[PDB]
Design a binder for this molecule. Sequence first.
Ligand SMILES: *C(=C)C1=C(C)[C@@H](Cc2[nH]c(/C=C3N=C(/C=C4\NC(=O)[C@H](C)[C@H]4CC)C(C)=C\3CCC(=O)O)c(CCC(=O)O)c2C)NC1=O
Ligand SMILES: *CCC1=C(C)C(=O)N[C@H]1Cc1[nH]c(/C=C2\N=C(C[C@H]3NC(=O)C(CC)=C3C)C(C)=C2CCC(=O)O)c(CCC(=O)O)c1C
Ligand SMILES: *C[C@@H](*)C1=C(C)C(=O)N[C@H]1Cc1[nH]c(/C=C2\N=C(C[C@H]3NC(=O)C(CC)=C3C)C(C)=C2CCC(=O)O)c(CCC(=O)O)c1C
Ligand SMILES: *[C@@H](C)C1=C(C)C(=O)N[C@H]1Cc1[nH]c(/C=C2\N=C(C[C@H]3NC(=O)C(CC)=C3C)C(C)=C2CCC(=O)O)c(CCC(=O)O)c1C
Ligand SMILES: *[C@@H](C)[C@H]1/C(=C/C2=NC(=C\c3[nH]c(C[C@H]4NC(=O)C(C=C)=C4C)c(C)c3CCC(=O)O)/C(CCC(=O)O)=C2C)NC(=O)[C@@H]1C
Ligand SMILES: *[C@H](C)[C@H]1/C(=C/C2=NC(=C\c3[nH]c(C[C@H]4NC(=O)C(C=C)=C4C)c(C)c3CCC(=O)O)/C(CCC(=O)O)=C2C)NC(=O)[C@@H]1C
Ligand SMILES: *[C@H](C)[C@H]1/C(=C/C2=NC(=C\c3[nH]c(C[C@H]4NC(=O)C(C=C)=C4C)c(C)c3CCC(=O)O)/C(CCC(=O)O)=C2C)NC(=O)[C@@H]1C
Ligand SMILES: *[C@H](C)[C@H]1/C(=C/C2=NC(=C\c3[nH]c(C[C@H]4NC(=O)C(C=C)=C4C)c(C)c3CCC(=O)O)/C(CCC(=O)O)=C2C)NC(=O)[C@@H]1C
Ligand SMILES: *[C@H](C)[C@H]1/C(=C/C2=NC(=C\c3[nH]c(C[C@H]4NC(=O)C(C=C)=C4C)c(C)c3CCC(=O)O)/C(CCC(=O)O)=C2C)NC(=O)[C@@H]1C
Ligand SMILES: C=CC1=C(C)[C@@H](Cc2[nH]c(/C=C3N=C(/C=C4\NC(=O)[C@H](C)[C@H]4CC)C(C)=C\3CCC(=O)O)c(CCC(=O)O)c2C)NC1=O
Ligand SMILES: C=CC1=C(C)[C@@H](Cc2[nH]c(/C=C3N=C(/C=C4\NC(=O)[C@H](C)[C@H]4CC)C(C)=C\3CCC(=O)O)c(CCC(=O)O)c2C)NC1=O
Ligand SMILES: C=CC1=C(C)[C@@H](Cc2[nH]c(/C=C3N=C(/C=C4\NC(=O)[C@H](C)[C@H]4CC)C(C)=C\3CCC(=O)O)c(CCC(=O)O)c2C)NC1=O
Ligand SMILES: C=CC1=C(C)[C@@H](Cc2[nH]c(/C=C3N=C(/C=C4\NC(=O)[C@H](C)[C@H]4CC)C(C)=C\3CCC(=O)O)c(CCC(=O)O)c2C)NC1=O
Ligand SMILES: C=CC1=C(C)[C@@H](Cc2[nH]c(/C=C3N=C(/C=C4\NC(=O)[C@H](C)[C@H]4CC)C(C)=C\3CCC(=O)O)c(CCC(=O)O)c2C)NC1=O
Lengths: 177, 177, 238, 145, 164, 164, 164, 164
Amino acid sequence: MLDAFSRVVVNSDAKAAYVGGSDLQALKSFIADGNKRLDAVNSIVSNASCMVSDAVSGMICENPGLISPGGNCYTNRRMAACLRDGEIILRYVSYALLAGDASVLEDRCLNGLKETYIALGVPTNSSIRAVSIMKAQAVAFITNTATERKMSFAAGDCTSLASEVASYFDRVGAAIS
Amino acid sequence: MLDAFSRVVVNSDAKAAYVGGSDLQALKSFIADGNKRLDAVNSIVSNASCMVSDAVSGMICENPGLISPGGNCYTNRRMAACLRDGEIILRYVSYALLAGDASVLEDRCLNGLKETYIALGVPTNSSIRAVSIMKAQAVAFITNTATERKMSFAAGDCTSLASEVASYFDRVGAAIS
Amino acid sequence: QTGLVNSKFSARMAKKTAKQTKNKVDEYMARSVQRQYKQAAVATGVYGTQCTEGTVKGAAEASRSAALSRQFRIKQRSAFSKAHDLFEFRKHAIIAAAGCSYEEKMVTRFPKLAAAMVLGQTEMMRTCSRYVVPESVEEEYMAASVDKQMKRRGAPGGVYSLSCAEGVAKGQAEIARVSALGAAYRAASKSASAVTAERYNSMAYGRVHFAHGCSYEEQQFNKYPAAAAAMRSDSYGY
Amino acid sequence: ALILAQNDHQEKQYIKYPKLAAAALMASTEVTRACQRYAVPESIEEEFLAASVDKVNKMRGTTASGVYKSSCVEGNAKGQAEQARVAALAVAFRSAQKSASQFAAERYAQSKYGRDLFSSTHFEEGYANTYPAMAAAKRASSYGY
Amino acid sequence: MKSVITTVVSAADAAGRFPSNSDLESIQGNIQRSAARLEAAEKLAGNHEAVVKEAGDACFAKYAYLKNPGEAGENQEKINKCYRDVDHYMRLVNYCLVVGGTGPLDEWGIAGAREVYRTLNLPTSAYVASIAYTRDRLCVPRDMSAQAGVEFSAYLDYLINALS
Amino acid sequence: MKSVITTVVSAADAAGRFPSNSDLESIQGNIQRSAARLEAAEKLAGNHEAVVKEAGDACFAKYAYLKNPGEAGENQEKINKCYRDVDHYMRLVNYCLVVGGTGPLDEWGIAGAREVYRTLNLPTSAYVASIAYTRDRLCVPRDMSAQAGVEFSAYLDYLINALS
Amino acid sequence: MKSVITTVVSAADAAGRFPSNSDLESIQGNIQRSAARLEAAEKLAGNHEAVVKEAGDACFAKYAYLKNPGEAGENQEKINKCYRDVDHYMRLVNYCLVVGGTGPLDEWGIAGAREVYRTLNLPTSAYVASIAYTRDRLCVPRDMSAQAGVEFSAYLDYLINALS
Amino acid sequence: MKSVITTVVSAADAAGRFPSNSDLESIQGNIQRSAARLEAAEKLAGNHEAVVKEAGDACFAKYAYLKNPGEAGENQEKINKCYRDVDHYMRLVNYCLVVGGTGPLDEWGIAGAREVYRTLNLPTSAYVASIAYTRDRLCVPRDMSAQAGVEFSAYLDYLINALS
Ligand SMILES: *C(=C)C1=C(C)[C@@H](Cc2[nH]c(/C=C3N=C(/C=C4\NC(=O)[C@H](C)[C@H]4CC)C(C)=C\3CCC(=O)O)c(CCC(=O)O)c2C)NC1=O
Ligand SMILES: *CCC1=C(C)C(=O)N[C@H]1Cc1[nH]c(/C=C2\N=C(C[C@H]3NC(=O)C(CC)=C3C)C(C)=C2CCC(=O)O)c(CCC(=O)O)c1C
Ligand SMILES: *C[C@@H](*)C1=C(C)C(=O)N[C@H]1Cc1[nH]c(/C=C2\N=C(C[C@H]3NC(=O)C(CC)=C3C)C(C)=C2CCC(=O)O)c(CCC(=O)O)c1C
Ligand SMILES: *[C@@H](C)C1=C(C)C(=O)N[C@H]1Cc1[nH]c(/C=C2\N=C(C[C@H]3NC(=O)C(CC)=C3C)C(C)=C2CCC(=O)O)c(CCC(=O)O)c1C
Ligand SMILES: *[C@@H](C)[C@H]1/C(=C/C2=NC(=C\c3[nH]c(C[C@H]4NC(=O)C(C=C)=C4C)c(C)c3CCC(=O)O)/C(CCC(=O)O)=C2C)NC(=O)[C@@H]1C
Ligand SMILES: *[C@H](C)[C@H]1/C(=C/C2=NC(=C\c3[nH]c(C[C@H]4NC(=O)C(C=C)=C4C)c(C)c3CCC(=O)O)/C(CCC(=O)O)=C2C)NC(=O)[C@@H]1C
Ligand SMILES: *[C@H](C)[C@H]1/C(=C/C2=NC(=C\c3[nH]c(C[C@H]4NC(=O)C(C=C)=C4C)c(C)c3CCC(=O)O)/C(CCC(=O)O)=C2C)NC(=O)[C@@H]1C
Ligand SMILES: *[C@H](C)[C@H]1/C(=C/C2=NC(=C\c3[nH]c(C[C@H]4NC(=O)C(C=C)=C4C)c(C)c3CCC(=O)O)/C(CCC(=O)O)=C2C)NC(=O)[C@@H]1C
Ligand SMILES: *[C@H](C)[C@H]1/C(=C/C2=NC(=C\c3[nH]c(C[C@H]4NC(=O)C(C=C)=C4C)c(C)c3CCC(=O)O)/C(CCC(=O)O)=C2C)NC(=O)[C@@H]1C
Ligand SMILES: C=CC1=C(C)[C@@H](Cc2[nH]c(/C=C3N=C(/C=C4\NC(=O)[C@H](C)[C@H]4CC)C(C)=C\3CCC(=O)O)c(CCC(=O)O)c2C)NC1=O
Ligand SMILES: C=CC1=C(C)[C@@H](Cc2[nH]c(/C=C3N=C(/C=C4\NC(=O)[C@H](C)[C@H]4CC)C(C)=C\3CCC(=O)O)c(CCC(=O)O)c2C)NC1=O
Ligand SMILES: C=CC1=C(C)[C@@H](Cc2[nH]c(/C=C3N=C(/C=C4\NC(=O)[C@H](C)[C@H]4CC)C(C)=C\3CCC(=O)O)c(CCC(=O)O)c2C)NC1=O
Ligand SMILES: C=CC1=C(C)[C@@H](Cc2[nH]c(/C=C3N=C(/C=C4\NC(=O)[C@H](C)[C@H]4CC)C(C)=C\3CCC(=O)O)c(CCC(=O)O)c2C)NC1=O
Ligand SMILES: C=CC1=C(C)[C@@H](Cc2[nH]c(/C=C3N=C(/C=C4\NC(=O)[C@H](C)[C@H]4CC)C(C)=C\3CCC(=O)O)c(CCC(=O)O)c2C)NC1=O
């Protein structure tokens, strides 16, 4: 497990160096953009039980062929599995939202997830739909452009926080396919 | 495990009444001197390893009848096992010292250890000497009257929260005896 | 080029073969069922103290090099002792799948998932060895009566085996000594509602996994539950 | 070539023109990857079983007395023979770099390649069904290697 | 009682270590943000008997079919067991901004709460029709300070998303 | 490795939940302390090889016997190999002051130390004869400030609290 | 307690076995070697006041720096108790000779060793410094035999190699 | 294969110890004891065609009901599958003279032997009849010497104690 405060002490390690005075600029900017970085998470996880139900039904009204027999989401048991793994995925990109590094996920969720939907035969293109539709709600929650919840905030720059939740969300799609 | 935050609400629900503004007499004060709390807990860990050679070796010099054949602490298997459990009564109270309540220690240590102090041969007489000096040193280590060390402090008052280090280490003898 | 045997120098086949991917889908499925049982251990964000790693200056780091080198011994087994616990772990893991055909689809598929789910179900219900101690010598001589019976599979012909091996270096099992005696104290001061399920489910843990028809042994379990909380399978020699 | 021709014209094209019947064999193994240079063995016994057959395939790169033929030869100039070695490993790193869909295709093909041209009995088409790379290393005896 | 600082010191028990500098700096943040919510506590706690008369029927404006013959909110011993119970959930979250952690949430409204709602045959979607109307009744001018309805707002829809 | 957030993100990982308001406040002390806690990063990293010379021979001031044959410091490169390590010891605690958590000093330096110093036959007090010269060479206003200064000594004697 | 004989009973305890013709056959060697190892048991005991004194300061003849205050080896009351420790070391090394193994030394000396020399900040190689004077001082034609000189010295270096 | 060597190294293996003083004298008794345990082995090997034959028909002399139809002696080949099964045991107890423990007997000869016989309808009361005939037929000046006859007898009755 690593993060952006401890990524530099990995980076300074292998060349046998320290945390130099000019490398602090990503991290001195962190603690001042941390007051808005904590203002970003509670916008997401307040509505979180809807976020999987908004998205996986968005795969249902996109593709209704999966709730037929033969589909991987037919039976009443397997949708209890699916909604469970739907809300796993944003539970771990929310960790990297507070951590600022990808070293939370492909050591805890992505290492071998490509191969463990291989033997279960889970259609990986359908899981991409359950990744991107969650991502679309995420950037609309950060920039508050989603229609039917208006949350109070402090004004200022937030345009780069939604820029990185794209980078985490497509990565979990990048490694499942 | 509670803290002094969650100590006071277990009786408020026991009368089912809401936390009033009359209840803010303790809560204005505790957050205000909260920096006066952990500015002494730095001193508690900063003499961790030397503590089990201060009061415990201050016990064998009070009574040398324990190192010869005929003592409970005769071999190194029980020489260490007296001072190994010396530092645990340092350790468990440090969680409770900042907590403002002994809910951390008194379930995981003080409940059950009295009967664990039954079956062994550990003397009731030497069960109270170390807990006084390691109270009376932390009485000094709050007050910085250590005769060979005066460390860094934001100087002023700290003897108000020196009342807890006497109010904590009395229930050791009140519940083991 | 030619074969690896003659007329060629360096190694080949940097490609995950069909057996090699079977191990990884086993391991990912096993880490999931490992972490899922520990979610049942700590059910809040406040840690239950049965997750207490070590309790002195160095016992927490000391538990690391013992646990993986013990796992090295489970990897170091013979062809017989690997074929035995293949078939033996799974039919215990069949039994924990109480009335589910779906779980016994994939427990005959992934033998490490069979291995990873049988022992963690015990640690969820704390129906195992160091989680429940008897109350008097009424049951103390009874609970440790099967303890000398269990290690008969350990040393088969007098000569000891690597199942019950404790330390691989100088001064290792002596930190394991003082640790589990603290667990023997950590088993002594649990909650009131806690301990009144460890006994009343270890007397159900034996009656499904070990009894199989004997109504005499059900008298033994339902009056002495701590004698059943030591009973384990043939795969652990100890 | 007579036992892979689909037409009766294609049969006549191989009988009369011998340089076509040669390269019609060779081109079939390139596209349906049943060469040695495309076969990765999936086990340590197969890497022994493939090694067991090309010890006989290299044994016709020498004469009846054991002196070397002109066929199996890996160099002609100062440094070329070492350059053939550093060449052939990049073939080998890319033979094991196929897609997941193309390892499946030549798995059935090399099994089909061995039991069509070299096998005449039931045990001979048992080593081809079970280990494809052992059947993929069966050369065509007009080479030396 | 899940709290802020009980969540810290337990891994120093669970891995067995001493309190270092890294363990105490988390409670340096328990000075400022601990203060800003405690104004919103008694601002709500003095008036908990009044805000239930628009919170309870906000479900019953939506779900008046629970007053049918043979139902869950049908009659006066169930009505006065309804109007008694709608503020119990707020006394849970009244103590939430007292400690700062989610203590009485995860102690007295989680375990079996999905069970006994189905088992006593009362709708789980009824309380979310009773308490989101309370949370969607925020006028930060006449309520409190600016930030005091930010963490406090996050509890009132936590129970929306946890319970259903 | 271990950070300020690593415990409170694993306290929601082992629980398997999204982060509640308990650990939402956990990063509040991360930003109130960083005003002067990485002050001693490049102040140290701009002055690190002055104090390797200052305290690195102040262990040979206490124990001036090490040049005898048989023990470690008897030739030129072996004491030159010492000065690498006493650089390393405020390397991986200078990492710790900006990491916040106590990860990479345990992950690399302080754990496993008892087993390798026993084998390589060198006293662990012969290290702390150097480290204990450093903290009483720090000045309270001159080198850094006070709240900067408390996060230098309490890492420095926490070192020897786990070396002794 | 470990010896020749208390090994093979606990070996043949858990196997459900009666001691067969290897278990007793190991003790068949343990009677003739007991003549050669208890020849050295009481010559150590009959002259034990020799080794406690001009080896304990000969220990100090290569660790002489402990005599300074600040350290723990400086004054006479910490010589009054200092020579008492090697009295427990010359006692415990005598009792291994009447057992047949390293039983009483490992049970009484090694268990709890590594944690009280360093929490007392005693340099643990100085507890080895006496033993090196003891080893090659016992010559062959004078003190012990040739076959008793080897095995007491084989009992001796167990106290060397376990301490550091 | 439980030998007088292998019984002690596994005891020090699992505890993680070197070959110590408990292990030096444990195999001291494998020369002066095996100065006589080999003496039965070359006596058994040069006279095995007669010893097996004498103990063979001593079984059929006692229980002459094996010849009947239905039992374990009714045909010529079941006569040879009995005279073979004592030549196996007169090799296995020859082998554990050479081992010096129970190794060849307890692993390859008696382990699960009480399942093959009870399923194949073999009277294990006749196996002890055919072994015990030679258990007294040894003559302490004539078969071997008395330091070898107590050795050879002690391996037979251990097999008799097993099957009974
Ligand atoms: C099928 C016909 C179909 C759907 C199901 C649905 C899925 C979908 N939704 C969006 C956009 C949003 N989804 C949101 C989630 C929720 N909205 C709510 O009101 C609650 C709080 C929550 C569910 C518990 C949100 C907030 C948005 C953003 C818009 C907004 O301001 O509300 C998408 C992507 C964009 C789109 O297609 O509209 C999809 C696929 N849409 C369907 O067509
Ligand atoms: C039930 C709670 C729990 C979970 C989940 C878990 O993973 N462990 C327990 C409690 C716990 N343990 C630690 C820290 C450590 N635990 C180990 C042992 C494991 N780590 C290993 O590498 C191996 C070998 C495969 C094992 C068995 C170790 C070595 C540590 C680190 C201690 C040290 O080395 O100094 C923690 C604390 C994590 C944190 O927040 O820092 C907890 C809660
Ligand atoms: C279950 C396998 C077994 C048999 C059979 C047996 O006799 N003992 C166990 C394992 C075993 N252990 C040793 C040596 C030691 N074992 C311990 C264990 C105790 N210490 C603890 O902290 C705990 C947990 C409560 C226990 C049970 C100790 C201290 C030793 C001494 C280590 C040493 O001296 O090297 C052995 C081999 C030697 C022996 O006869 O005990 C075995 C097989
Ligand atoms: C032809 C197939 C051969 C038969 C039959 C045989 O017994 N040996 C083959 C011919 C041959 N080659 C050499 C020497 C070299 N051959 C080299 C090429 C191999 N090394 C590689 O890395 C690869 C690809 C993976 C191949 C094919 C190299 C290089 C040499 C060394 C050249 C040099 O100048 O030393 C010989 C001579 C005997 C020997 O093995 O050196 C023969 C007979
Ligand atoms: C004659 C005095 C016996 C008797 C012997 C029979 N044994 C038969 C089969 C048999 N016996 C064994 C055990 C033996 N064989 C071994 O290789 C070893 C150890 C190295 C031992 C101890 C086995 C395993 C078997 C089955 C396989 C085989 O044929 O060898 C047997 C035939 C049984 C049958 O045909 O039904 C006979 C007659 N029977 C007696 O009653 C006395 C005791
Ligand atoms: C009866 C309990 C088992 C058993 C288990 C062993 N545990 C050993 C180490 C160990 N295991 C845990 C439990 C951890 N794994 C989980 O799956 C869960 C919850 C679902 C938890 C908390 C802990 C905390 C520890 C260290 C403490 C300890 O047990 O001493 C272990 C190795 C030896 C050892 O150190 O104990 C074993 C063998 N023992 C048994 O025989 C049955 C299978
Ligand atoms: C009216 C708007 C509600 C409603 C209220 C009812 N609750 C009934 C029983 C009940 N509910 C709980 C859960 C809640 N009440 C509490 O007092 C506490 C904590 C202390 C909690 C979490 C409990 C514990 C109980 C039993 C004791 C009690 O009366 O409080 C109930 C009776 C149903 C029946 O008897 O069948 C009613 C009418 N029920 C509704 O359906 C709407 C949404
Ligand atoms: C100097 C102040 C000490 C002293 C130092 C010596 N250390 C020697 C060897 C050594 N030390 C370590 C651990 C250390 N090196 C690291 O890179 C790190 C972590 C970043 C640590 C904690 C290692 C791994 C080694 C072996 C490799 C090497 O340095 O050559 C050493 C030489 C012993 C030898 O190799 O014979 C010395 C002299 N010893 C002293 O007496 C003073 C007090
Ligand atoms: C003298 C050459 C040493 C030295 C010796 C000191 N040891 C002190 C205390 C101490 N020593 C031991 C080890 C030994 N004594 C025992 O009784 C047993 C087991 C039966 C052993 C192995 C122990 C366990 C202790 C602590 C308890 C006790 O006093 O017996 C000591 C006093 C220290 C103090 O008063 O704090 C001294 C001076 N110290 C030196 O500096 C040189 C190297
Ligand atoms: C423990 C709980 C806890 C938190 C959650 C944060 C809450 C928090 N966020 C901001 C403050 C802010 N938050 C934002 C963020 C945003 N504004 C937008 O329009 C976007 C929707 C969104 C970015 C995605 C911005 C832009 C600021 C102003 C910059 C700043 O004050 O640092 C502030 C300072 C202003 C104020 O007083 O409110 C605080 C206290 N701090 C805490 O102590
Ligand atoms: C810690 C790692 C971890 C994960 C990554 C998730 C994901 C995950 N899901 C399943 C198991 C499953 N996962 C799904 C989900 C889906 N199938 C689809 O076609 C859709 C793309 C998607 C719906 C959202 C289904 C349907 C099953 C069950 C299949 C079945 O019942 O046959 C499994 C195997 C375990 C089991 O079968 O019980 C895992 C690991 N859960 C975890 O614990
Ligand atoms: C027979 C032997 C014997 C001893 C060793 C001492 C042990 C000892 N010290 C103190 C009293 C104290 N003990 C310490 C402890 C220490 N001081 C430090 O600098 C270190 C951190 C740590 C030792 C490693 C401190 C700080 C005080 C308070 C007075 C002071 O030293 O300033 C007390 C209680 C009150 C007193 O009498 O002073 C005792 C019993 N006394 C004895 O009778
Ligand atoms: C997270 C890191 C962290 C720490 C390391 C400690 C360190 C610490 N202590 C105080 C601050 C203080 N500390 C003391 C303490 C004392 N005065 C005395 O005379 C006694 C010797 C001693 C304890 C008994 C007093 C009196 C104050 C000022 C009053 C107050 O802060 O309430 C302050 C605030 C003042 C400042 O900004 O410098 C800090 C950061 N607290 C923290 O938050
Ligand atoms: C258990 C048996 C046993 C011993 C041998 C002695 C070991 C021993 N010998 C001497 C004292 C002596 N020890 C020896 C013996 C030897 N000197 C050498 O140079 C050789 C290495 C070795 C003979 C091979 C001699 C010759 C003396 C006389 C003075 C001296 O040389 O040191 C002393 C110092 C006290 C004294 O003056 O007696 C001691 C502890 N003590 C014992 O308890």
